[PDB]
Amino acid sequence: SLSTRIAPHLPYLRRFARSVTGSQSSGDAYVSAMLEALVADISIFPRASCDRIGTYWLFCHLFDQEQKTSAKLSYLTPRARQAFLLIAVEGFNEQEASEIMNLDARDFRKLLNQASIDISQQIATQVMIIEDEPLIAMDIEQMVESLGHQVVGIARTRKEAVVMYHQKKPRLILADIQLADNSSGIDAVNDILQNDRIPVIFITAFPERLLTGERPEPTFLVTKPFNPDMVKALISQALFFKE
């Protein structure tokens, strides 16, 4: 039956509905209403590419007619949000997602572009870089600005970093652990972090002396804090999935 055809898609549809509306109760109310609409008139179910597409098509057609994630996605227009989620979470290709939203290919990509810009715009912020090597600092500056972030300054020493922190109030720090010939970079971060809890990424250049040609190679080294439990789980994960 149509019912046995739709039922295996409902776990996926419910996730979609929850992610679009921001809660399971809103999500499920829409999925409910969709099933009530089919009980009332089974003819509204489309002849689409396949049942999955048909089910999501109907959901989107009727729609238009945790706290953190919802707060951010709720800033997108309902349609940009749908487009982004169909790709990002629901696992559709572009041709499928566009069929679902009743858009031609160009218009669907325009919606995706809108979602992408809107997300970047929402998280654009003020960034301080702690780095004494100028070429490395400029490389990070370029990367950060390409995302819409404002680099408020580049601090070269622990003292410059703390002064700059207070004059500029960045909301994100990219910091080299090593400055000059010591680990004063992490000290600068520690000083700052008593003032405020702000996200920090520890980063430096991958050393050129180890780079060759003829393979994709890395450009940076990013360092994260771990506790012992995390180290042991990481070791186990690395061996378990070893290439």
Binding site: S3, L10, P11, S19, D28, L35, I42, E66, N93
Partner: protein
């Protein structure tokens, strides 16, 4: 991933997408609630009888 083409198209937001997928996977109850099951039954009956 059957998400790798999708993640590529999403550019700088690919890790955001990955994390969202993990979040929705981790938070969703695997069972369909009673109200949705009742609707599936009524939809089955409605097609069966042509109601």
């Amino acid at each position: 991933n059957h998400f790798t083409f999708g993640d590529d198209l999403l550019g700088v937001n690919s890790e955001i997408a990955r994390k969202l997928r993990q979040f929705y996977l981790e938070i969703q109850e695997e069972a369909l609630p009673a109200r949705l099951l009742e609707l599936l039954e009524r939809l089955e009956q409605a097609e069966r009888f042509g109601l």
